[PDB]
Each structure stands twice: as C-alpha cells, then as structure tokens.
C-alpha cells in the first residue's frame, strides 16, 4: 500500500503512443534539471535550479 | 491594523487579542546549483548553496 | 619649424570590461509562495525558459 501526492511528472510517450519512461521532478535537483531542459539526459556542466 | 512595505505586501500586523506588533518574514529564500559530470557518466551530483 | 627638447607625458585610459551577472526565479517573482498562483502560472513555463 502506498499513498498519492499532488507532484509534477515528466511522461514519455514513444512511437506506439505507450508510456515508457517517466521523470519525478521534485525527487532531486538533478530530477529538476531534466524537467527544465525537457529531456532525460544532462550534458556537464553546472545548472540553477530554484 | 496592518503595515506595508514598498511592493505593497503585508509586513507587519497588530494581533487582535494581545494588541502586539508581528513582523512577517517569507520562509523561501536562498540560491541553489546543481554540478554534474553529464548523465551518460554518472548519476553523482554536488549541490553548492549560495 | 623643429623641436628642441621633448617632453615625456603619463597619460590614463579607463575601460569596462565586465557586467554583474544576474539570475532570476521566475515562480518567486509571479507567485511568491501561493500554490494556486504557482498552478495557474504552470501554463507559461515555456517563457520562464
Ligand atoms: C629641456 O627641458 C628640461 C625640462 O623639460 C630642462 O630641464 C630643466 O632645466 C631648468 C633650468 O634650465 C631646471 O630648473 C629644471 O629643474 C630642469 N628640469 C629637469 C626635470 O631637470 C632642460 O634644461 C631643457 N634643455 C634645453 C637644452 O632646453
Ligand atoms: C511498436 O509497434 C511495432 C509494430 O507493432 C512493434 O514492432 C514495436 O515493437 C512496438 N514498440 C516499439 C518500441 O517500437
Ligand atoms: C482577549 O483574550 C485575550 C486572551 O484570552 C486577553 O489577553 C485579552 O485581554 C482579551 N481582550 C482583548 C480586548 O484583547
């Protein structure tokens, strides 16, 4: 059992129209940063969050 | 009754049972970065607190 | 006309180089700390971007 929180999630939708992936973008600063560049992956380097 | 700053907001209130002056003070403050070596490398990220 | 003697003269020029750099939250800005603003404002983040 677990319980639902009002959160903000970045979905991925593939060719086939199938939710494969998704981003919690308020786990982590990292999660943060996905969510603002709008991909799964960061290049390096140093970012503002918020 | 109540005391406003430059930007208008509420900064200050008398309490309506001890007739005592409050300050209020926002509870959001502070600047955050997030540093990473790029997500293909690793998922190790440093967090610096301005 | 010709010159005789000389003369050895300091002169000083000032130049700007640099600006202060600047960050912005966007969401502190607009809302402050109202959740419904901030639900509200989640329809413009393109432009906070
Ligand atoms: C060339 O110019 C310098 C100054 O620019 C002259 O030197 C000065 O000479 C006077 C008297 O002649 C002194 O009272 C000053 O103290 C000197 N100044 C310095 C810095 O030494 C020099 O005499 C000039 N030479 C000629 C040939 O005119
Ligand atoms: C998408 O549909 C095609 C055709 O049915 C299938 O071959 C493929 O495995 C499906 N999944 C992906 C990720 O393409
Ligand atoms: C109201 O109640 C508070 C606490 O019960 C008391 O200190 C105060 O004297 C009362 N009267 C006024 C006018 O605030």
Same mark, same amino acid.
């Given at each position: 059992?677990?319980?639902?929180?009002?959160?903000? &999630?970045?979905? %991925?939708?593939?060719?086939?129209?199938?939710?494969?992936?998704?981003?919690? #973008?308020?786990?982590?600063?990292?999660?943060?940063? %996905? #969510?603002?560049?709008?991909? &799964?992956?960061?290049? %390096?380097?140093?970012?503002?969050?918020? | 009754?109540?005391?406003?700053?430059?930007?208008?907001?509420?900064?200050?209130?008398?309490?309506?049972?001890?007739?005592?002056?409050?300050?209020?003070?926002?509870?959001?403050?502070?600047?955050?970065?997030?540093?990473?070596?790029?997500?293909?490398?690793?998922?190790?990220?440093?967090?610096?607190?301005? | 006309?010709?010159?005789?003697?000389? *003369?050895?003269?300091?002169?000083?020029?000032? /130049?700007? $180089?640099?600006?202060?750099?600047?960050? $912005?939250?966007? *969401?502190?800005?607009?809302?402050?700390?109202? *959740?419904?603003?901030?639900? /509200?404002?989640?329809?413009?983040?393109?432009?906070?971007?």
């Amino acid at each position: 059992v677990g319980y639902l929180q009002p959160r903000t &999630f970045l979905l %991925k939708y593939n060719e086939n129209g199938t939710i494969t992936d998704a981003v919690d #973008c308020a786990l982590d600063p990292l999660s943060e940063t %996905k #969510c603002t560049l709008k991909s &799964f992956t960061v290049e %390096k380097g140093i970012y503002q969050t918020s | 009754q109540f005391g406003r700053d430059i930007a208008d907001t509420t900064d200050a209130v008398r309490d309506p049972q001890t007739l005592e002056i409050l300050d209020i003070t926002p509870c959001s403050f502070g600047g955050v970065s997030v540093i990473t070596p790029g997500t293909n490398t690793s998922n190790q990220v440093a967090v610096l607190y301005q | 006309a010709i010159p005789t003697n000389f *003369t050895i003269s300091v002169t000083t020029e000032i /130049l700007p $180089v640099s600006m202060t750099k600047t960050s $912005v939250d966007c *969401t502190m800005y607009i809302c402050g700390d109202s *959740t419904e603003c901030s639900n /509200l404002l989640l329809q413009y983040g393109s432009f906070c971007t």
